[PDB]
Each structure stands twice: as structure tokens, then as C-alpha cells.
Design a protein around this ligand. Structure first.
Ligand SMILES: COc1nc2[nH]cc(C(=O)C(=O)N3CC[C@@H](O)C3)c2cc1C(=O)N1CCn2c(cnc2-c2ccc(F)cc2F)C1
Length: 330
């Protein structure tokens, strides 16, 4: 058991093993410090969960994130380098610290990029989503601020599995029981923005947001309208002035025609017809980077816990178990 030390940073107590030095503040449900990991020589990011057992909700979210981070093993997905608590027993267990790679910027901080840069960033996001989606995990809130990018332009996806401008219309309006392509929609919005410099769909509310979408992609046709349950959703949509799909070749003029093709296939309104991550990786736009032998899928992931209703102390105990049984990477 490591020796721990405490400090105050920004009114919050950090108590971490002495292995980790030079904590400096820089997270989902928590606060994040950069640190130096003496043991491996790596620059790391440490996140301290804020009040991880405040309520059943916090407790089950704490477990959920620990289980997710423990399962993700992929170069473009944040995973666990360490996890620890200063508690020496379950009874005393009230704090959770999670250690991962420090990338040091977000995709906003990298941004108007060149085509070869866009190719490589979106390639990596899609390679990471192929892996996440194969574990039957959806991101649901993919956005430039949770794509962590280092100076080498290497990219990892953060804060997946936990959950305006990058969200799919079928989540804006609560349509057809959505699929993993909600996340494809967001990549399309992100890729657009990298190519043009501008937010594709900067809505001011859920309403303005949907209006901006269908201005690009057209109002739903009868094929998609057939698949909408809500009299309300249908009423709202069909009561709008009806709009055609724009010519993306015209909207994205100047861009690599291969990228415009890809964007058309990511920004389809009908989720059933949107390209998957694995399909997108095979698209000609990524010919320079694509390699079917090096785009892995994930090991089976057990999410049966999600459908259980447990007491705070049970979720806490299960989380503690998961802290104890953590095995470092080689
Ligand atoms: C999107 O990711 C980023 N965005 C940034 N923007 C500014 C940044 C500066 O580091 C920063 O402000 N500075 C200050 C000085 C210099 O370091 C630049 C910056 C850093 C990152 C980054 O690498 N992170 C990875 C770990 N991370 C992050 C959020 N949540 C976690 C996390 C999740 C799971 C876990 F196990 C542990 C965790 F720490 C962010």
C-alpha cells in the first residue's frame, strides 16, 4: 500500500500516493489535475470524483465509470492507468481517484484545419468509436471538448458511456429508439466544423437546433415519418414548412469531394440509413490511414448492472471491489 500525501488545490483536498508528483489543476463528475508519475515516467491526468456516494445516482454513476474505464483498452479511447483510494477499508471508503494519459488539449484547442489533418483526426475518432460501439457502448455526447488530443495530433475519446450543437436530431426530439449512429451524427458535425471553421448547427435551444438541422438535411419524408411514434413529434415536424435536402457538394464547396461524400453519409436524418463507424473507416476518404487488420473490436462488456436497482452501500461496495481487483497494464 503506497504512502499517501495531501494537499489543497482550488479548495479541494487531493490525497494521492507519493508516486504521483507535481499535481497541477487542468472532468465528468470530478476535478482533474495533471501529475508526474515517477514510477513509469509518464505524464498523467488524475481525476478525483466529486462526492461519489452522495445519492444512489452518484453511486451507480461512479460504478459505471469505473467499470467502463476498466474495460476500455484501445489507443483512441481513454482507459485506466491506475485507480486508488486513500481508504484502507470499505467502511472508510469515500473517495475515488482515476488515472489516465494526459493528452493536454481538446479538439477546440487544436482548431480551420487542412484536409490531411482532418483525415487523421476523424480517422482516429471513428477507429475509437468502432471499438466502443462493438462493446455495445454508445458515447451519446460526443463533442470537440471530449476529444483529448496531444501535440502529436494523437486523439482519445473521453467521457463515453456516461450521458446541444453536435447531438443527433432523434435525441433532440426523442424519436425512434436510437442506435449507435447518434455518435456518427456528432462526428459529422465535428468533421464539418474542422473543414469549414464554423459550427455546422449552432442552435440556441432544442427548437432552433432542430430548425437548423432540417435546413441542411430536409424535413423527413414519408419513409421516415412512418417510423415516428409521437403524434406530437409528427405533428411538430409535419406542421413545419417542408424543406428539401441541400446539395452538400454546393454547401461544402472547396472541400475534398471524398470528404463531402462522407459527410453526406454521416448526416442522414434517418438513423437507420446513417453510416456506421466500421463502414466509415472503409470509406475512400481514409485510404491513407485505413487498415482492417488494425481497427480492433472490444472484448465482451457486461452491462447487466445497468438494469439493477441497488442501495448506495451495495453500489459502493461493488465499486470498492473493482478498485481492489484493478490490474495495471504491462
Ligand atoms: C479533452 O482533454 C483535455 N483537454 C484539456 N484542455 C486543457 C487541458 C490542459 O491540460 C491545460 O489546461 N493545460 C494547463 C497547462 C498545460 O497542461 C495545458 C486539457 C487536458 C485534457 C486531457 O488530457 N484530459 C484527459 C484526462 N481527462 C480529461 C478530462 N477527464 C479526464 C479523465 C477521465 C478519466 C480518468 F481516468 C482520468 C481523467 F483525468 C482531460
Amino acid at each position: 500500500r503506497p504512502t499517501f500525501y495531501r494537499q489543497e488545490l482550488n479548495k479541494t483536498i487531493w490525497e494521492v500516493p507519493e508516486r504521483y508528483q507535481n499535481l497541477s489543476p487542468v472532468g465528468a463528475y470530478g476535478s482533474v489535475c495533471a501529475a508526474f508519475d515517477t514510477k513509469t515516467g509518464l505524464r498523467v491526468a488524475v481525476k478525483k470524483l466529486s462526492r461519489p456516494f452522495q445519492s444512489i445516482i452518484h453511486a451507480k454513476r461512479t460504478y459505471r465509470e469505473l467499470r467502463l474505464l476498466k474495460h476500455m483498452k484501445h489507443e483512441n479511447v481513454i482507459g485506466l492507468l491506475d485507480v486508488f483510494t486513500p481508504a484502507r477499508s470499505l467502511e472508510e471508503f469515500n473517495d475515488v481517484y482515476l488515472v489516465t494519459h494526459l493528452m493536454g488539449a481538446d479538439l477546440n484547442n487544436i482548431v480551420k484545419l487542412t484536409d490531411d489533418h482532418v483525415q487523421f483526426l476523424i480517422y482516429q475518432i471513428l477507429r475509437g468509436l468502432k471499438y466502443i460501439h462493438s462493446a455495445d457502448i454508445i458515447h451519446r455526447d460526443l463533442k470537440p471538448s471530449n476529444l483529448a488530443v496531444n501535440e502529436d495530433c494523437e486523439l482519445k475519446i473521453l467521457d463515453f458511456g456516461l450521458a446541444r450543437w453536435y447531438r443527433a436530431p432523434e435525441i433532440m426530439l426523442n424519436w425512434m429508439h436510437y442506435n449507435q449512429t447518434v455518435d456518427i451524427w456528432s462526428v459529422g458535425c465535428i468533421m464539418a466544423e474542422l473543414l469549414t471553421g464554423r459550427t455546422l448547427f449552432p442552435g440556441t435551444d432544442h427548437i432552433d437546433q432542430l430548425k437548423l438541422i432540417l435546413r441542411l438535411v430536409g424535413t423527413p419524408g414519408a419513409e421516415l415519418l412512418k417510423k415516428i411514434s409521437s403524434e406530437s413529434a409528427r405533428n411538430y415536424i409535419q406542421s413545419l414548412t417542408q424543406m428539401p435536402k441541400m446539395n452538400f457538394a454546393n454547401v461544402f464547396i472547396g472541400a475534398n469531394p471524398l470528404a463531402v461524400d462522407l459527410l453526406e453519409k454521416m448526416l442522414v436524418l434517418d438513423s437507420d440509413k446513417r453510416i456506421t463507424a466500421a463502414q466509415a473507416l472503409a470509406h475512400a476518404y481514409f485510404a491513407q490511414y485505413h487498415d482492417p487488420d488494425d481497427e480492433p473490436v472490444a472484448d465482451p462488456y457486461d452491462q447487466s448492472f445497468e438494469s439493477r436497482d441497488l442501495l448506495i452501500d451495495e453500489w459502493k461496495s461493488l465499486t470498492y471491489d473493482e478498485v481492489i481487483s484493478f490490474v495495471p497494464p504491462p
